[PDB]
Amino acid sequence: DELERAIRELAARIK
Amino acid sequence: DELERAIRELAARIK
Amino acid sequence: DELERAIRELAARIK
Amino acid sequence: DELERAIRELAARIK
Amino acid sequence: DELERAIRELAARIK
Amino acid sequence: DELERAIRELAARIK
Amino acid sequence: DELERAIRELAARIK
Amino acid sequence: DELERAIRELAARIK
Ligand SMILES: [Cl-]
Ligand SMILES: [Mg+2]
């Protein structure tokens, strides 16, 4: 899923 | 993952 | 982890 | 307000 | 208000 | 203003 | 202005 | 589309 991967990227950047 | 889950819940909320 | 906690808390309140 | 805070903590991480 | 100001700050940093 | 407006509209969807 | 446009286009789609 | 993109463009701006 493209939304799930986008969210994974944002969470990685925040952390 | 907990942060990913929270972002997903906020995203679902917006959409 | 300030942003992360802020996001977690907002999601927790929303649901 | 969890919302206002998520918005400020986001603003703080924006380069 | 508090929210309107948080939003003002966020928009400022984005731009 | 338009970015503040959009952010305001999104904040209202989370609320 | 990439984040700014992505946010305004999202708000126009889901206001 | 719009949501996935906003999330990615946000991620790119997170320091
Ligand atoms: Cl990816
Ligand atoms: Mg673009």
Side-chain angles (χ1 to χ4, degrees), chain A, chain B, chain C, chain D residues 1-14, chain E, chain F, chain G, chain H residues 1-14:
Chain A
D1 179 15
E2 289 323 303
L3 185 66
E4 263 176 35
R5 269 171 283 198
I7 290 172
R8 191 127 55 227
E9 176 56 26
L10 176 59
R13 238 62 290 141
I14 289 175
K15 291 188 170 176
Chain B
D1 200 6
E2 291 305 289
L3 172 56
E4 292 173 12
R5 176 196 268 77
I7 295 170
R8 186 170 317 186
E9 296 176 353
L10 295 166
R13 182 76 179 207
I14 288 183
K15 181 254 303 304
Chain C
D1 71 342
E2 284 289 334
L3 179 42
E4 168 179 356
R5 286 185 176 280
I7 289 166
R8 302 277 236 71
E9 283 150 32
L10 178 54
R13 169 169 173 176
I14 285 307
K15 80 176 185 178
Chain D
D1 182 45
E2 285 86 354
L3 179 60
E4 189 222 310
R5 181 187 289 114
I7 291 174
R8 286 177 180 292
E9 292 300 327
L10 197 63
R13 285 293 290 286
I14 298 300
Chain E
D1 64 301
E2 291 289 283
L3 179 58
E4 278 177 60
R5 292 165 168 169
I7 293 171
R8 185 181 76 184
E9 178 56 10
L10 176 58
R13 249 59 294 159
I14 292 173
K15 293 195 189 181
Chain F
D1 194 305
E2 291 307 290
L3 174 55
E4 284 165 356
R5 187 178 196 171
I7 292 175
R8 202 159 309 199
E9 296 174 7
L10 294 182
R13 292 283 303 170
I14 286 166
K15 177 177 297 302
Chain G
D1 72 347
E2 283 289 352
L3 173 44
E4 171 185 356
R5 284 183 185 280
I7 282 160
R8 312 200 322 166
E9 297 160 10
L10 170 60
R13 184 210 88 179
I14 69 196
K15 58 154 130 283
Chain H
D1 200 349
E2 288 89 354
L3 182 63
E4 180 272 27
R5 181 183 293 117
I7 292 169
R8 278 178 185 287
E9 292 297 340
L10 182 52
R13 287 288 289 291
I14 293 298

